[PDB]
Amino acid sequence: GLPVMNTPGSNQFLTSDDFQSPSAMPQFDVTPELNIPGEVQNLMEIAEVDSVVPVNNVEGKLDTMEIYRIPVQSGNHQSSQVFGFQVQPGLDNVFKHTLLGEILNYYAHWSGSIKLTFVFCGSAMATGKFLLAYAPPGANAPKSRKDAMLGTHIIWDVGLQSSCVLCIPWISQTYTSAGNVTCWYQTGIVVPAGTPTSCSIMCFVSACNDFSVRLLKDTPFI
Amino acid sequence: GLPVMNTPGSNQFLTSDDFQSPSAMPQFDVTPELNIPGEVQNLMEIAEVDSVVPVNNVEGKLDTMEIYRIPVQSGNHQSSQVFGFQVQPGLDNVFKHTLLGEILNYYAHWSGSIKLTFVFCGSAMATGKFLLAYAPPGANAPKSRKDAMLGTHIIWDVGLQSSCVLCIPWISQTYTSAGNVTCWYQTGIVVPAGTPTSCSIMCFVSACNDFSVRLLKDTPFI
Amino acid sequence: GLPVMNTPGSNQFLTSDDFQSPSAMPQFDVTPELNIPGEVQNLMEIAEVDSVVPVNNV
Amino acid sequence: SESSIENFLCRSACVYMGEYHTTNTDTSKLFASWTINARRMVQMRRKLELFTYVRFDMEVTFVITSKQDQGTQLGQDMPPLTHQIMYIPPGGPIPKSVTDYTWQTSTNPSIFWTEGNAPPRMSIPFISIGNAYSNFYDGWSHGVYGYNTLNHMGQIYVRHVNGSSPLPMTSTVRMYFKPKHVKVWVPRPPRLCQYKNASTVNFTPTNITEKRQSINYIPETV
Amino acid sequence: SESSIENFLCRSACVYMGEYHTTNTDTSKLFASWTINARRMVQMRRKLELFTYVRFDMEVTFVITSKQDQGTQLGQDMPPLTHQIMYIPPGGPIPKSVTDYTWQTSTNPSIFWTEGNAPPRMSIPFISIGNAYSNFYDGWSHGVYGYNTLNHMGQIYVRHVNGSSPLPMTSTVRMYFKPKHVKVWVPRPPRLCQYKNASTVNFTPTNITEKRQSINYIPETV
């Protein structure tokens, strides 16, 4: 009874199908759920957390805590570069193994805004100024302190603030075609008698709320 | 007519499926049911019945009625142990073949509370005292009458009551990690002239209403 | 269209099944029934009739 | 919920496996047969013996596989094979050859099936002029002890459906049996001894349980 | 939307491939077996380690292919082959031969399937007396470090369903596994080192990231 007609696709196993299946243990009442703290609904809750960037990824110190410390030297060098990098999460070595980088490497297309925080870890007696500069994608990195001043920049006085924040708006993926960030000595570091001479800066990266990902794929790390 | 499309899983025989089947004897009216006394809806109605425990399961008497009798001896032994066991239904030899043990061995996970009853089968002239003690799972069995008194216990006077009852609350399954029960001579048994000297105790086990079972499996006895 | 899933028992011939079947002569109007005397609905109408017993079966 | 009667008993199992040929010189090897009862499957037998009276419907599925005999002749081109599965109710004619008239009686329900399709399946109702089946009978058949004729459930017979002078082939059938809509009365204790034959309750005496070291022994706690 | 937990974890994968014969002189080559866990699939393992507690149902599909052994004998005419796929819950009997009694226990769910039809499929619920599974355990089994018994999920066993003296054949089974209705708790950092074995977290020390030329180096812009 009930005349019926089989269509193409019958009796195939499609690895991504979605069908009701027969239970092998129907007479078994399951343990009820517990209210465990710390539940997750979405992977973007992991990428919105700050993590420390290994900005000092040069030879001889890829296996020490020193990889995370930007060196600030003593004396008068008030126009020299402190650091610089291209902003390319997912592809570039300095951003590749962070919490944000590890997520982005599961997807073939992504886009959003990024947040960078810088923190000064010197003694409370040290004072000085840094110049933090941002170049957009398609622009060359500045070569001097003066042309970095002629673009988008902030002047950061560490005797007043211990930390600075930046939000970068046009991030996508695929000799890069990406924006960059650089830091310059505006003045030099000045200390009283009896304080350590050298010091360090640390970088933290995170994602802002408008971040999106597409086309789940396999990661290239295991 | 009616375009139709076969999905994966078509024309397979799944041993636990649930489908309507064609009757081979459609023109046959069945005998109506009779109201037979003693109908059962659930196996937990069998486990809530008391059954006698073979507490005396030692060598030389595994095939006699003596396996069920705890010996109470005559004279003055007022701090010695009478008996002791771990409370492990399903696994332990003394509980394994009872009505509760036989059910539990059909399931791979179970939990609830247990009820133990003790009955004194001596003459109506005998008097004395016993100390019944319970140790929780993770605790060692008491070594003396005094440290059994320092835990959870009841003092049972057989000249007043012929039976005692215990309810044990935290029972689950998998050098055991289970609770235990022990019995001690508080006073010794005292009789008049012309009564038997020795006597016996009997144990009954049962389940309390909150007992649950999961994952039907095969029993290891046939 | 209309996702569908074949169950066990598909494409078998069960001798006591009960299904609609396609007619091989759809354009043929059948002769109407006649009211013939003596219609039967049930075999117990045959057993409720007396019949002679061969008691002397020697 | 998993200890309800339906979830405990309503489960499928292989209860008979048999072999039959298309040509042979024994003529009893040309068909396969089985008498329906639940006493030669030791795991189902024990679960059924917890009750005195039972009532259920039966569902039977058949898995059938064929082979060309290793005798000699190759290069064949054969159409798929057809099989006939006949159920005989209680009080029916029994075949004795594969050419018998009873393979055509109108009141023996029958199934015709050809290989390559889904496995065949028939559904049998509760067939008894009594009101329930009995697992235990303390009586005489009219004289055999322990055997009452109200427990007859019928028979199954399987043959090939070729024509005249067929080609040599060997088939195997496996029968999967499942009770449905089950009701039970008067619970009993579980079988403690091993079963000895399929028609009696005969047994050799068995120990009540296994031994331990002493009546005080409890194993050392971890 | 593609970063939700369900879209990230609920995907099918081949986790076990095994071979088994109908006749052999080893008797362990007559059946195939697999213990269910998610630690020997390196790509699923890493995605699962981003969380500390998980809860899911399982869906398993089986792809099965056969072959006649290249030994010697040709000209055969065989019916299609039947297979049995048995699931054992935690706390169930394990077979040791293909002729064992446990292949017939009423509480081990089982599937019977013949070649040519759609691929078979069963659905397993969340089976644990705890409230979630754990990917990480900082404890002792009672003694193995890092192993807790609440993570038992059962086993799968596969054999042929012939009769007596079968013909030689070799089969291969592939198991496809998929979690469903998933919930996760307590996110973790991603695994940075390669996995070394399937039961521990053991590792050899790894670099934090790869090097570049200097702390100022940015590549020339196109």
DSSP string for A22-82 = -BS-TT-PPPPPP--S-EESBTHHHHTS-EE------TT-TTSGGGG-EEE--S--TT-EE
Query: Distance from CA of residue E163 to its chain's centroid?
Result: 29
D-facing residues of E in 39-68 (CB < 8 A) are none
Tell me which amino acid residue B189 is. I
Widest CA span in chain B: 100
Single out the residue of D65, D10, D61, D56 nearest to residue D37, CA to CA: D56
Q: How far is D179 from chain C (nearest CA, A)?
A: 18
**Do A83 and A141 meet the contact criterion of CB atoms below 8 Å apart?**
no
**Do D210 and B57 meet the contact criterion of CB atoms below 8 Å apart?**
yes
Chain A residues whose beta carbon lies within 8 Å of the beta carbon of residue E127: 25, 28, 30
Single out the residue of E9, E33, E7 nearest to residue E20, CA to CA: E33
Residue D205: Cβ-neighbour burial (10 angstroms; 0-12, 13-18, 19+) = exposed
Q: Catalogue the E-assigned strands of D38-92.
A: 51-67, 82-88
Q: Does the CB of E148 have a partner CB in chain B at under 8 Å?
A: no
Single out the residue of A186, A81, A187, A55 nearest to residue A143, CA to CA: A81
Instruction: Give the 3-state secondary structure of residue E174.
Output: strand
Pairing, β A129-135 against β A180-185:
antiparallel
Q: How far is C10 from chain B (nearest CA, A)?
A: 5
Does A13 sit within 8 Å of B8, measured CB to CB? yes
Distance CA(A102)–CA(A97), nearest Å, equals 6
Residue B196: Cβ-neighbour burial (10 angstroms; 0-12, 13-18, 19+) = exposed
DSSP designation for E80: P
Does E118 sit within 8 Å of B10, measured CB to CB? yes
Chain E residues whose beta carbon lies within 8 Å of the beta carbon of residue A87: none
Which residue matches tokens 């080893």? E26
Count Cβ atoms below 10 Å from residue D214 Cβ, excluding itself: 13
Single out the residue of B217, B110, B221 nearest to residue E109, CA to CA: B217
Which pair of structure tokens corresponds to residue B95?
A: 């509980």
Distance CA(B194)–CA(D113), nearest Å, equals 84
Binding partners of B (≥3 Cβ pairs within 8 A): A, C, D, E
Q: How far is C43 from chain D (nearest CA, A)?
A: 15
Does E92 sit within 8 Å of B14, measured CB to CB? no
Does C11 sit within 8 Å of D111, measured CB to CB? no
Does E117 sit within 8 Å of B14, measured CB to CB? no
Distance CA(D18)–CA(A21), nearest Å, equals 32
Chain D residues whose beta carbon lies within 8 Å of the beta carbon of residue C16: 109-111, 122
Chain B residues whose beta carbon lies within 8 Å of the beta carbon of residue A29: 212, 214
Q: How far is B12 from chain A (nearest CA, A)?
A: 9
Q: How far is E205 from chain B (nearest CA, A)?
A: 37
Distance CA(E25)–CA(B191), nearest Å, equals 73
Mutate to test the interface with B, among C7, C10, C13 (most CBs of B within 10 A): C7
Does E117 sit within 8 Å of A28, measured CB to CB? no
| Minimum Cα–Cα distance from D8: chain A residue | A27
Tell me which amino acid residue E181 is. H
Closest CB from E107, E112, E118 relative to B106? E107
Chain B residues whose beta carbon lies within 8 Å of the beta carbon of residue A26: 16, 18
Closest CB from C5, C16, C18 relative to B7? C5
Q: Does the CB of A29 have a partner CB in chain D at under 8 Å?
A: yes
Chain B residues whose beta carbon lies within 8 Å of the beta carbon of residue A32: none
Helices (H), chain D: 5-9, 42-48
Chain A residues whose beta carbon lies within 8 Å of the beta carbon of residue B4: 4-7
CA distances from E194 to A222, E40, E82, E190, E203 (A): 7, 13, 41, 11, 7
Pairing, β A107-121 against β A212-216:
antiparallel
Strand partners, D50: none
Single out the residue of B177, B67, B55, B172 nearest to residue B118, CA to CA: B55
Which pair of structure tokens corresponds to residue C58?
A: 């020697």
Does D13 sit within 8 Å of E77, measured CB to CB? no
Mutate to test the interface with C, among A5, A10, A13, A14 (most CBs of C within 10 A): A10
**Do D169 and D67 meet the contact criterion of CB atoms below 8 Å apart?**
yes
Which pair of structure tokens corresponds to residue E219?
A: 């590549």
DSSP designation for D103: G
Instruction: Give the 3-state secondary structure of residue B212.
Output: strand
Q: Which H/E stretch holds residue E6?
A: helix E5-9
Which pair of structure tokens corresponds to residue E153?
A: 């999920």
Count Cβ atoms below 10 Å from residue A97 Cβ, excluding itself: 21
Distance CA(E109)–CA(E98), nearest Å, equals 16
Binding partners of D (≥3 Cβ pairs within 8 A): A, B, C, E
DSSP designation for E2: T
Does B216 sit within 8 Å of D8, measured CB to CB? yes
Chain D residues whose beta carbon lies within 8 Å of the beta carbon of residue B55: 215
Q: How far is A207 from chain D (nearest CA, A)?
A: 49
Q: Does the CB of E142 have a partner CB in chain D at under 8 Å?
A: yes
Tell me which amino acid residue E45 is. R
E-facing residues of B in 62-121 (CB < 8 A) are 106-109, 111
Q: How far is E173 from chain D (nearest CA, A)?
A: 19
Does B6 sit within 8 Å of A6, measured CB to CB? yes
CA dihedral B49, B50, B55, B56 (to 10 degrees): -110
Instruction: Give the 3-state secondary structure of residue D44.
Output: helix
Q: How far is D97 from chain B (nearest CA, A)?
A: 24
Does B15 sit within 8 Å of E112, measured CB to CB? yes
Mutate to test the interface with E, among A19, A25, A80 (most CBs of E within 10 A): A25
Residue A2 region by backbone torsions, left for phi larger than 0, else alpha for psi between -120 and 50, else beta: left
Chain A residues whose beta carbon lies within 8 Å of the beta carbon of residue B9: 19, 21
- Taking the CA of residue E19 as centre, how many other CA atoms within 13 Å lie in the half-sphere pointing to its CB? 6
E-facing residues of D in 163-222 (CB < 8 A) are 167, 169, 171-172, 174, 176, 222
**Do E51 and E186 meet the contact criterion of CB atoms below 8 Å apart?**
yes
Residue A25: Cβ-neighbour burial (10 angstroms; 0-12, 13-18, 19+) = buried
Count Cβ atoms below 10 Å from residue A187 Cβ, excluding itself: 16
3-state helix, strand, coil in chain D (%, to 5): 10, 35, 60
Distance CA(D217)–CA(D73), nearest Å, equals 71
Instruction: Give the 3-state secondary structure of residue D46.
Output: helix
Q: What is the resolution of this structure in A?
A: 2.5
Distance CA(D42)–CA(D5), nearest Å, equals 19
Does E209 sit within 8 Å of A97, measured CB to CB? yes
Instruction: Give the 3-state secondary structure of residue D105.
Output: coil
Does D74 sit within 8 Å of E75, measured CB to CB? yes
